[PDB]
Paper text:
Mutations within the olfactomedin domain of [name] (OLF) cause a gain-of-function, namely cytotoxic intracellular aggregation, which hastens disease progression. OLF is a 30 kDa, Ca2+-bound 5-bladed β-propeller. β-propellers do not have a canonical hydrophobic core. Instead, the radial arrangement of β-sheets composed of 4-antiparallel strands form a toroid that forms a molecular clasp from the extreme N- and C- terminal β-strands. β-propellers are stabilized by hydrophobic interactions between β-propeller blades that surround a central hydrophilic channel. In OLF, four of the five blades are further stabilized by ligand binding to a dimetal center in the central channel.
Next, we probed motions in OLFWT that could be relevant to aggregation-prone partial unfolding. First, to probe picosecond time scale motions, we solved a 1.27Å crystal structure of OLFWT. The new structure shares overall features with our previously reported ~2.1Å resolution structure (r.m.s.d < 0.3Å) solved from a pseudo-merohedrally twinned crystal, but the newly refined structure has a low B-factor range (10-30 for Cα, average 15) and limited anisotropic translation/libration/screw (TLS) motions. Furthermore, structural refinement using a multiple conformer algorithm is largely consistent with TLS and B-factor analysis, with fewer side chain conformations modeled in the center of the protein than on the surface. Overall, the main motions in the near-atomic resolution crystal structure are seen in alternative side chain conformations and the external strands of blades B, C, and D. The finding that OLFWT remains globally unchanged despite the subtle change in the NMR spectrum is supported by a number of experiments. There are no changes in the unfolding properties of OLFWT incubated at 4 °C for several months, nor are there changes in the crystal structure described above, which was solved from 10 month old crystals. Second, CSP trends among OLFWT, OLFD380A, OLFI499F, and OLFWT incubated with 1 or 2 M urea reveals that the structural features retained across all four proteins are primarily surface-exposed, particularly within blades C and D. These regions coincide with areas of OLFWT found to experience some undulations in the picosecond time scale, but limited exchange at the microsecond time scale. However, unlike these model systems, OLFWT exhibits limited ps-μs scale motions typically associated with access to a well-defined low-lying, partially folded excited state that is prone to aggregation. Bioinformatics analysis and experiments identified two APR sequences within OLF: P1 (G326AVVYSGSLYFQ) located in the two innermost strands of blade B and P3 (V426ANAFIICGTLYTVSSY) comprising the two innermost strands of blade D. A third stretch, P2 (G387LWVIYSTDEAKGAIVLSK) within blade C, was predicted to form amyloid but remained soluble when tested experimentally.
Residue numbers in the entry: 244 to 502
Amino acid sequence: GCGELVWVGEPLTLRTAETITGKYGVWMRDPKPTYPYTQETTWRIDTVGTDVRQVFEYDLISQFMQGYPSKVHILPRPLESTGAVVYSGSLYFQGAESRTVIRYELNTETVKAEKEIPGAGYHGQFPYSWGGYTDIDLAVDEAGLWVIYSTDEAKGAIVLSKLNPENLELEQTWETNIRKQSVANAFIICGTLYTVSSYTSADATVNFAYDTGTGISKTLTIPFKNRYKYSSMIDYNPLEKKLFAWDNLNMVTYDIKLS
Ligand SMILES: [Ca+2]
Ligand code: NA
């Protein structure tokens, strides 16, 4: 079941974007799929530019890997950066030039909730180390939906909060001692936040852990390879128990092992 991260496998490339619009992006599957979607449904957002609204949806993995989308959704408001997730039928994304998270229900194309993440920096205040306006990073783990951010009161250290997926209320918050701008990205596995040291290196590491159950911080040295030298997005999927990442045009996955 659950445990501490102990190993990350080699990146596997599933699709490569063919234009610069996909240099950065987010791709994802739903770890709690709901009708009409399934555990194979995949979403892809190419996130370069200033008016990002198109969300590509694929019914089957084979379509994601080789074909055109099954459907394209046009979001009612432009999206910011690479932090979005899908969870239990909704895309959760940050509005451009805002600290607002939006719940967009995919089957009805309806905005169901919006919430300012209180005190969160946005638009280049507390990005990860590559920039990209990556101030606010949503995450799904075994327990549900979270948000990773920082605030002036936390002096740029990573803050994580559990979110109610229905109405986006913050349920509980934890403050780490990890400077968000000093790490390439982060993700949560089994209630532990992990960070990646570098977005360019073939020889990066998963370098810090913060366990929300115990409050304990640790250092780690688990190898992590950025095959294409520019990882813009690194998230965990708790149904597949894999990392999903976006690395310089390439949509990649990594296997992991937990103790
Ligand atoms: Ca992430
Ligand atoms: Na995310």
